[model samples]
Target chain A: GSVSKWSTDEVSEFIQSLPGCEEHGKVFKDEQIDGEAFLLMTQTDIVKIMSIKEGPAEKIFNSILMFKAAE
Target chain B: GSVSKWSTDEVSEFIQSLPGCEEHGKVFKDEQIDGEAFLLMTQTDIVKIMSIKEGPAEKIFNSILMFKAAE
Candidate 1:
């Protein structure tokens, strides 16, 4: 399914599956961030709200950017 | 605040703080498991849903049990 259509659980799984993002995935899961919210997330949200480290947060944010581009 | 009043982010922080549970915290976060759901979680949920290993899962579950008793 498209990233936008993914459920919260799916979003969690996706975040965890990313390299160096296993732990950071929990923040997204805990926040109940679904694909829709995920698509809207910014670097600040990933860093501050998700508590992801800068390096991994950039990677994840870039990944999200790619996903957005694909859409 | 009491465990029950903890938001999903707080719960995620708690799970990540547990010994040997940092990675597993992601599953709980992803699932949007707040303190209320956390308090009600069984060993099976910790092991299966949270994807925590047996040893760590038991430790977390027991911690929850103690928290419940205190309440």
Candidate 2:
């Protein structure tokens, strides 16, 4: 499925799947950062808006980059 | 100078002093993020509000951390 079409739950799941991002998954859900916002997010959004730590933020961001690259 | 007592220019200068944070110095000046705000900031504020990249953001955040530690 296109990332943009993903539901907030899916976005949360994806975030939780990333190493060190388990706790942040709930943050995504709470913020309603669905796939559309997820795809548009920069590391800044992840770190600042989600209050994610740098290491986990990097991992999540790189995963998004890879996902985009594969598309 | 006591960080809380520093002027905006002083805060800008301190931000610029961090390796890779030269450009963000101006951002602090423009936003009026004086020493008080700088000292209280979490990494989220720097990354989100300043639009700083992770590498430079880390350098800036760690510098702030060190400053607080020495206080």
Candidate 3:
């Protein structure tokens, strides 16, 4: 997927749609987190950010990694 | 995929191996988390546990949802 094709607002909405994402919506709008950053983030970084245990963290990571190449 | 087919020890090892997962290894062993629990947890629960913003929480969830059917 073209990073340019993805809007900050669109990504923010997407984040907001997920449960407990309310806190991150402003982060996305503030440009603290971006489509590019999420796409590039490692499992460890995500674990640190979300403060989740590894079992569930990896499951979530593996699930979303597929869409990075979205056409 | 059969949940029983996954071993607690193996699952623990998998969780332990993920980056920043060390803290969670004991949790996995203590039965506070398990293959079944991880498989069933939602995006919000993960966020609450991990203390992460929603942007990356869903990313990890989406990625791992693919393998729940593991053969």
Candidate 4:
């Protein structure tokens, strides 16, 4: 069904727990965060961690907190 | 740089506030939608959500709404 949902605190809780992430570097962590914190992730990163894609995933690792530093 | 993204709506606003989702038993709604509707969420879900390990992301959450869902 590719359909899912999360709550405010629920999303925050999950995003905060991501393995490769740091609190400060995240757009979500910023109290000033204006909206959905998405990230441009890598293929390797996605495969190893979230198992999604190398694009924008608002819910999981492709989220802003899971981004890869540009090489 | 673990950069930033997300344009449809404030997925960060509320995974639960997520507008487009409904109790369709599995079908997602449009007003229950947020434009880029959500419950844009976090971990545990990703760890437990979709599968990037198998292949591409277009089949991921965004493509359903169709975000990067990129290659």
Candidate 5:
């Protein structure tokens, strides 16, 4: 996608909350996060990331929570 | 094309050899770093990591083989 799926209103809200609530990088703009710092994903996109078979993606999950709560 | 050329099996094989790896960011993944935050790449993909015209990508070549291969 050429642009972020997040609404302009959502983006502005994030900007308004910056100090403790900023969603830079993969989380805010991309809407998904298969792996932080590498892959960008959206909440709706799944399946492939789960298939990576790392036994469990505890780190990936944690990162997602970190970003989600930021908003 | 319906999809890209890489195989899921190959990506899996890559997971096993990882750490020092964990292959974060581009290269092992989707980021074809044409130069954003020191540029990102993979075992096979070569690219211009910075765009201020730092010169040829010889350093980029070296960085790949180096791979944090610290001994």
Candidate 6:
């Protein structure tokens, strides 16, 4: 009973609003990205794209993963 | 209360059993790895370590992330 198929924009909206993630929100906005682009990604993908490590990159990608899990 | 500080072994046990993850289980077993070693890693790290793409690498790391979230 998990009808949690969040749309592209809806996912992006929730993510951009999370604290300490202004950069990715900026990235998302600048790149015109949405949840669909990010849906299949994990923290590692963000590390590659952002050129950062797990310590510095956790906030955005983990939040997205948690959002997916919570949904 | 969320006292979900799972030890390294417990985490490893759950992860190795997941579908299509035998190689990593072998990696862990052969390397004597524990949860602590993996707790902070994301899919990207695994990709680098395993030298695989996001598609093949995701099963292990995403399962770990989802496990952390579920905890």
- Tens digits of per-residue lDDT for model 2, B2-61: 466668897787566443565778888998887777788888887887788877787667
Alpha-carbon shift of residue B31 in model 5 (angstroms): 29
Taking the tens digit of each residue's C-alpha lDDT, what string does model 6 give over A1-71?
11145445544554443333434555554555555565566777768875645643675666555445534
Q: After superposition, how far is residue A13 of candidate 2 from its true place, in Å?
A: 49
Best by DockQ: 4
**Is candidate 1 or 4 superior in lDDT?**
1
Pairs with backbone N, CA or C atoms under 3 Å apart (clashes), candidate 6: A44-B44, B8-B35
> lDDT per residue, candidate 2, A14-46, as tens digits?
666443566888888988988777777889988
lDDT of 5 at B40: 35
Q: After superposing candidate 3, which stretches have Cα over 4 Å from the reference?
A: A1-71, B1-4, B49-63, B69-71
Q: Which has the better TM-score: candidate 4, or candidate 5?
A: 4
lDDT of 4 by residue, A1-71 (tens): 11122323444444443323324234433432323323334345534554433333333544433222211
Docking category of candidate 6: incorrect
Question: After superposition, which runs of candidate 5 have C-alpha atoms over 4 Å from their true positions?
Answer: A1-49, A54-56, B1-71
Between candidates 1 and 3, the TM-score winner: 1
lDDT of 3 by residue, A1-71 (tens): 34434566755654443333435556556655555665676678657865655654554455245435431
Note the residue pairs that clash in candidate 1. Answer: A26-B26, A29-B29, A29-B30, A30-B29, A30-B30
**Predicted complexes: DockQ each:** 0.02, 0.02, 0.03, 0.05, 0.01, 0.02
Q: For model 5, how does the per-residue alpha-carbon lDDT over A7-48 read when each residue is reduced to its tens digit? A: 544443432222222223224345432223223533233225
Candidate 4 chain A lowest-lDDT run of ten: A62-71
Query: What is residue A24's positional error in candidate 5, in angstroms?
Result: 20
CA lDDT, candidate 4, residue B69: 29
